[PDB]
Design an enzyme around this catalytic site. Structure first.
Site, PDB file in Angstrom:
ATOM      1  CD  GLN A 134      16.390   3.069 -10.622  1.00 40.11           C
ATOM      2  OE1 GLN A 134      16.281   1.987 -10.046  1.00 40.11           O
ATOM      3  NE2 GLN A 134      17.184   3.245 -11.673  1.00 40.11           N
TER       4      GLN A 134
ATOM      5  CG  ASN B 256      11.343   8.638 -17.215  1.00 41.21           C
ATOM      6  OD1 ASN B 256      10.736   7.579 -17.378  1.00 41.21           O
ATOM      7  ND2 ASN B 256      12.391   8.745 -16.406  1.00 41.21           N
TER       8      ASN B 256
ATOM      9  CD  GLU C 285     -11.913  25.449 -13.077  1.00 45.02           C
ATOM     10  OE1 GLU C 285     -11.110  26.289 -12.620  1.00 45.02           O
ATOM     11  OE2 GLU C 285     -12.514  25.598 -14.162  1.00 45.02           O
TER      12      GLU C 285
ATOM     13  CD  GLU D  63      16.960   1.591  -5.179  1.00 47.73           C
ATOM     14  OE1 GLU D  63      17.684   0.586  -5.345  1.00 47.73           O
ATOM     15  OE2 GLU D  63      15.977   1.848  -5.905  1.00 47.73           O
TER      16      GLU D  63
ATOM     17  CG  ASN E  79       5.972   0.464 -17.815  1.00 43.88           C
ATOM     18  OD1 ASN E  79       5.694  -0.200 -16.817  1.00 43.88           O
ATOM     19  ND2 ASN E  79       6.577   1.644 -17.745  1.00 43.88           N
TER      20      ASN E  79
ATOM     21  CB  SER F 276       6.561   2.376  -8.757  1.00 40.32           C
ATOM     22  OG  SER F 276       6.979   3.350  -9.697  1.00 40.32           O
TER      23      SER F 276
ATOM     24  CB  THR G  14       9.995  -5.454 -13.962  1.00 36.72           C
ATOM     25  OG1 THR G  14       9.286  -5.135 -12.759  1.00 36.72           O
ATOM     26  CG2 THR G  14       9.640  -4.438 -15.037  1.00 36.72           C
TER      27      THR G  14
ATOM     28  N   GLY H 269       9.215  -1.618  -4.057  1.00 35.69           N
ATOM     29  CA  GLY H 269       8.926  -1.714  -2.636  1.00 35.69           C
ATOM     30  C   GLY H 269       9.117  -0.395  -1.917  1.00 35.69           C
ATOM     31  CB  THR H 270      11.598   2.336  -2.308  1.00 41.16           C
ATOM     32  OG1 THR H 270      12.718   1.510  -1.964  1.00 41.16           O
ATOM     33  CG2 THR H 270      11.799   3.726  -1.723  1.00 41.16           C
TER      34      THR H 270
END
Lengths: 439, 116, 432, 439
Positions: free
Chosen positions: A11, A228, A254, A71, A206, A140, A179, A144-145
């Site tokens: 995500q 973002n 370069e 997901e 973060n 990330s 988190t 887990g994805t």
């Protein structure tokens, strides 16, 4: 020519890619429809957009990126958006079962099921392109994805293209705030893969974003959109000499050739500047020397670490906007004689000069203001090794009595991989310490 | 963590000559993570060091005082400065922060200054 | 035819070459279209040296642009005079150099070299007889330095009886652009001292200081430096471009100015460097020009020639003044400044005046001389390279390219021999 | 060039700074917005405003001053004013807790907490400038803020910049009238710091201003506004040759070098003239001799000290307005022969000639009228050493039974500092007596 393919996993990767693509379309005047409907009043767009987009026979622009997530909820969220007419449904692969900060399933029982499809997609995308330099894998470590699926995919991508650059962009779990709980579980395994199978890696958190936004932008209620936006501005600044030209063009090769002094040490310290709001950009004279000095300020750093704890091995310097060479020379002359900034007895100087004529643009509804010039820095220091050490401490304490491990045992892996990971990280920290020690 | 919690709204950019200046780990022992470097017998460097020592010994014989490699170095440095070419008006000796704040950097013509 | 073939390499080399071409086109009256709009006399007879006769009187440039990045040709073509060159000479590859000399010479210097060899041949046999080949490049990159040395070696091997002159750019520790720049400099200097007739020294920091302290420019950029170097080369070649009373040529200067083939470096320089407001308040005379060509403030060296002794001096003038003033000036200079030139060799200054004044300026003269000041640059380069090679940082790239490390060993050996030679010829005693 | 940095501590310091900045903007035609909106009818402004203001690329003026206070309320009332769009919020640092006439907390438990912030602010301001000569620190002895915080800041400013001038401007507790009770307690500690760590200090009070306003201006209900206006006029007159020019330019160094005869005696006696309102500036011929004679009158001094009790060591006199040299020469010839004025058998003469072509300006709504020329004098006499005598007497007769000291003990300090300050003041008074004694 200078064309790359972006990879967005999880995500976070998907939303980062969406922010980057919308930033590119607005900064080049690309309309959400996919055509140029501006037939009355033109507002730009006559440039080399072939770097990221593609030109059809009908004047249509097709994004060149990979949007894969285990997901389907994120895919559906993007699909109902206002930009669904830009990309293609074939590029957003859904899934039945997902990882959700689990490496076990996402690397063995989930990720291994959708491999041929993504491989065919990426091969078709590469064939659709002429010149390939590198990739933009957005994932990330907590997700887990973005950890299991990302590691497995990058393994075959490494074994399939040895001559192409392999970049990395993800989020690092902050030692203070977090988190989930199983983040170090995934991180300890993902770090080994990103180290022994990739060429460069970018590590951000973060908490630094929150600190800088509350300090400069002065917001009481932050949101993921601004994060973002900052990341997308960073990415655009990095790959600025590719979409446009300038006095001294700095391509991917370069700067990556010098950004890696050793195969084991390829973790630069990114920092964007100026990170300011609208009112913070009106009554503040902006020059190059001040912001370059501000670039080394640890409060402005993207990672919570003291540069003064260690010293610098290599530094990569970038610019974007109306910059004059004499100001850069004055800044270099100033920084080379600062006693606060620590460096080794080995490298008297190292940096690059990337002059970009095209100024950064603004976003309607965002927080960034109209700044005549921007700047980004990529240095290499041993002081950042503390984060890996804190992670290792957490792993050892959480591995002494095997907390939340029986799940991974049941899914089916070798337990010795944890020992392999900890010893590899110990060797990496030892090598970093050896490098940091001077004569 | 203690600094961040006690000062609350603090970063490590809040650096100043304070007793809590975390550079003080190295100040306790500069030798820590430092290796002694005695004058070695590297023949690669000795190829030029033999010539340099010959020159230093010739100078010592012509003068009559023991000089080391360093002592030699500041000797010819002082000799060159006293030789006349001290170059005090160009980038061979001037500090980096010595060109921006020079009236030669006031290209803005003295006409407007006359108006002022 | 007697023509000169011009060669291009490196983005900085490409831009300075484009600036020089624009300067000479403006001076000799050439429109951006390609026709001739000049109104002079000596701009039609010897115009064929750098141009080629074609139909309709439309002269064409004679320059081969060698590069590894396609982004340079688009930039240089969009200019006011980028539509007049030969697109066939823009031989560009697909992969960048990455500021690597070994990789650029090995990978991007095998399959692309054939086309540039073929085109430079075709140009050579297109003419009757030639004198030499001019290559303006820089050592700051893998494009100019990685390929210029190889091309010069090839042209020397094929045509030994030609002039190999170049205007490469020397590095500076103060003003740097590449992390591995000293490695490239050490690799390039070997080929420069082994397979190159003569080489001129170009620095950007010294030019920046010169403009900043004498020209007093608001926002000096690379365009100003390109203008200055273009004027320098134009003054160099006007001995052949515009004949006068006492004409000279490149090979005579090379022979008379080089005591030993191992030492072929020089020090360029132009005389009238004044501010914008000082153009209307000046006295045009010989002694002022002599002082500006003798002092260390006006020269473009990032060093001091007063640390050593003058070896060879050639004062090329371009104007209509006299002959006695030059000889009396050099005589009294040698008499008074006796501790600045080699006493063993009297009359180290050469006289050369061009009766044809340049366009846009009435008095002009350049300084070509080889003084004892490069020893500091050479010694600091040797020191920093010995450092960088001690622990071998930034070497795994070169190693993975395939070439070994003994090349660095032999290069630094040649470097040490060269600096030893320079320092023991600096103190040129008469006898024991 | 001639650019200085102003420091404003305490409510009094902040209001002095506000008066000074508003006076500068009105005298230089600077509009409150910060730009030059006068496009129809010009009214001045073509001068060297770089001394105090800064020029942006967009035609904006940024004040260069420090507005610090432990109590947020003063900052709040300044922010809600009409000049909030002129300065920047970052220069106005608020606070949670304050001193409010207490040296203890404001020097140990309050002032020591906001240090690195103000140091970073002042460092940035100094870096934004090219030429620095001295500073303008505005505080007070009665206010615990402007005493503890001022002393602590100035100590590090001294240890960090030794080659720059360190000025001082504050308010003296009048022996007859006062605002608080613990004023001598703060003063006795602040004087030691301002003596052993500074080069010059200016000492003034309020009852003298009260006397001069009721005697000349003839007001029955005075206000702090006129108090601040007089001090701002004094400051402008002192630094008049910096913003403008004249026949003989007298810089900060020029007068500061001679105004300090000894390291321990650097307390000049300022006197502004003319101090008259509108009706007192219409039917009164004004020349130089009369005002110069009036300068030495005790009724016009801002310190209650009869000059006839001691004698003068050094005198620094300044002029502003259309002044003629012959009048100054005649005045000097007159005063050098007056038997009333006393001076040592040692200094036959000493003074400065400051000719400023720009006349002082007026303010709409103020009490000052339009005067063709002005004059300010800075003399050094031992007759003012009397104030410290009563200060020491009061401190002793409070300290005998330890009045209001258990609070300071509980806050946590050494009690011997009181003895140290007392003996240091005794030594200073002894030195003043010794110097005042001729042969």
């Amino acid at each position: 020519m200078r064309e790359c393919i972006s990879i967005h996993v999880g995500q976070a990767g998907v939303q980062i890619g969406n922010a980057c693509w919308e930033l590119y379309c607005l900064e080049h005047g690309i309309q959400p429809d996919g055509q140029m409907p501006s037939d009355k009043t033109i507002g730009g767009g006559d440039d080399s957009f072939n770097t990221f987009f593609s030109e059809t026979g009908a004047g249509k622009h097709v994004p060149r990126a990979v949007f894969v997530d285990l997901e389907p909820t994120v895919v559906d969220e993007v699909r109902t958006g206002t930009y669904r007419q830009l990309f293609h449904p074939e590029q957003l692969i859904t899934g039945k079962e997902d990882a959700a900060n689990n490496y076990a399933r996402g690397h063995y029982t989930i990720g291994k099921e959708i491999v041929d499809l993504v491989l065919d997609r990426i091969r078709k995308l590469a064939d659709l392109c002429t010149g390939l330099q590198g990739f933009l894998i957005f994932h990330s470590f907590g997700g887990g994805t973005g950890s299991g699926f990302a590691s497995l995919l990058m393994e075959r991508l490494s074994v399939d293209y040895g001559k192409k650059s392999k970049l990395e962009f993800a989020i690092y779990p902050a030692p203070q705030v977090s988190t989930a709980v199983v983040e170090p579980y995934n991180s300890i395994l993902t770090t080994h893969t990103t180290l022994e199978h990739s060429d460069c890696a970018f590590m951000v958190d973060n908490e630094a974003i929150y600190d800088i936004c509350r300090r400069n932008l002065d917001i009481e209620r932050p949101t993921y959109t601004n994060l973002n936006r900052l990341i997308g501005q960073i990415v655009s600044s990095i790959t600025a000499s590719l979409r446009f030209d300038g006095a001294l063009n700095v391509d991917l090769t370069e700067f990556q050739t010098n950004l890696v002094p050793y195969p084991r040490i390829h973790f630069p310290l990114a920092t964007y500047a100026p990170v300011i709001s609208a009112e913070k950009a009106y009554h503040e004279q902006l020059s190059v020397a001040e912001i370059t000095n501000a670039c080394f300020e640890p409060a402005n750093q993207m990672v919570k670490c003291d540069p003064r704890h260690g010293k610098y091995m290599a530094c990569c310097m970038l610019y974007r906007g109306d910059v004059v060479p004499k100001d850069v020379n004055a800044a270099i002359a100033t920084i080379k004689t600062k006693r606060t900034i620590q460096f080794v007895d080995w490298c008297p100087t190292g940096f690059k000069v990337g002059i970009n004529y095209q100024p950064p643009t603004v976003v309607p509804g965002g927080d960034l203001a109209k700044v005549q010039r921007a700047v980004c820095m990529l240095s290499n220091t041993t002081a950042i090794a503390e984060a890996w050490a804190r992670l290792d401490h957490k792993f050892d304490l959480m591995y002494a009595k095997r907390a939340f491990v029986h799940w991974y045992v049941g899914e089916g892996m070798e337990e010795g991989e944890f020992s392999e990971a900890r010893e590899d990280l110990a060797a990496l920290e030892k090598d970093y310490e050896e490098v940091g020690v001077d004569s | 963590l203690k600094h961040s919690n006690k000062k609350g709204n603090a970063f490590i950019e809040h650096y100043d000559p304070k007793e809590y200046d975390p550079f003080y780990m190295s100040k306790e022992d500069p030798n820590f993570l430092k290796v002694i470097m005695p004058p070695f017998r590297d023949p690669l460097k000795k190829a030029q060091y033999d010539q340099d020592d010959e020159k230093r010994t010739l100078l010592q014989c012509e003068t009559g005082k023991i000089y080391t490699m360093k002592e030699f170095k500041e000797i010819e440095k002082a000799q060159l400065h006293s030789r006349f070419p001290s170059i005090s008006n160009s980038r061979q000796s001037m500090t980096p922060n010595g060109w921006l704040k020079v009236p030669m950097s006031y290209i803005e013509s003295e006409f407007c200054k006359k108006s002022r | 035819m007697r023509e000169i073939v011009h060669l291009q390499a490196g983005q900085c080399g490409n831009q300075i070459g484009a600036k020089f071409w624009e300067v000479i086109s403006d001076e000799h009256g050439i429109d951006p279209t390609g026709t001739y709009h000049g109104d002079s006399d000596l701009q039609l007879e010897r115009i064929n040296v750098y141009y080629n006769e074609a139909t309709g009187g439309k002269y064409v440039p004679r320059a081969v642009l060698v590069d590894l990045e396609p982004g340079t040709m688009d930039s240089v073509r969009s200019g006011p005079f980028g539509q007049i060159f030969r697109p066939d000479n823009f031989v560009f590859g697909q992969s960048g150099a990455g500021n690597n000399w070994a990789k650029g010479h090995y990978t991007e210097g095998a399959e692309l070299v054939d086309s540039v060899l073929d085109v430079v041949r075709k140009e050579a046999e297109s003419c009757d007889c030639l004198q030499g080949f001019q290559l303006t490049h820089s050592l700051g990159g893998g494009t100019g330095s990685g390929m210029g040395t190889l091309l010069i070696s090839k042209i020397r091997e094929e045509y030994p009886d030609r002039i190999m002159n170049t205007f490469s750019v020397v590095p500076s520790p103060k003003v740097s652009d590449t992390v591995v720049e000293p490695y490239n400099a050490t690799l390039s200097v070997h080929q420069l001292v082994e397979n190159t007739d003569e080489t001129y020294c170009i620095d950007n920091e010294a030019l920046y200081d010169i403009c900043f302290r004498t020209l007093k420019l608001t926002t000096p950029t690379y365009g100003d430096l390109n203008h200055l170097v273009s004027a320098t080369m134009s003054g160099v070649t006007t001995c052949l471009r515009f004949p006068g009373q006492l004409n000279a040529d490149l090979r005579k200067l090379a022979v008379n100015m080089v005591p030993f083939p191992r030492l072929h470096f020089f020090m360029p320089g132009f005389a009238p460097l004044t501010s914008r407001g000082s153009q209307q308040y000046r006295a045009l005379t010989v002694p002022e020009l002599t002082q500006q060509m003798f002092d260390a403030k006006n020269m473009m060296a990032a060093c001091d020639p007063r640390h050593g002794r003058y070896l060879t001096v050639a004062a090329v003038f371009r104007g209509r003044m006299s002959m006695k003033e030059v000889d009396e000036q050099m005589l009294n200079v040698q008499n008074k400044n006796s501790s600045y030139f080699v006493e063993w060799i009297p009359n180290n200054v050469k006289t050369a005046v061009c009766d044809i004044p340049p366009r846009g300026l009435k008095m002009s003269a350049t300084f070509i001389g080889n003084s004892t000041a490069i020893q500091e640059l050479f010694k600091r380069i040797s020191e920093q390279f010995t450092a960088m090679f001690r622990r071998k940082a930034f070497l795994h790239w070169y190693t993975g390219e395939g070439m070994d490390e003994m090349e660095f060993t032999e290069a630094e050996s040649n470097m040490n021999d060269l600096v030893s030679e320079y320092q023991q010829y600096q103190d040129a005693t008469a006898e024991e």
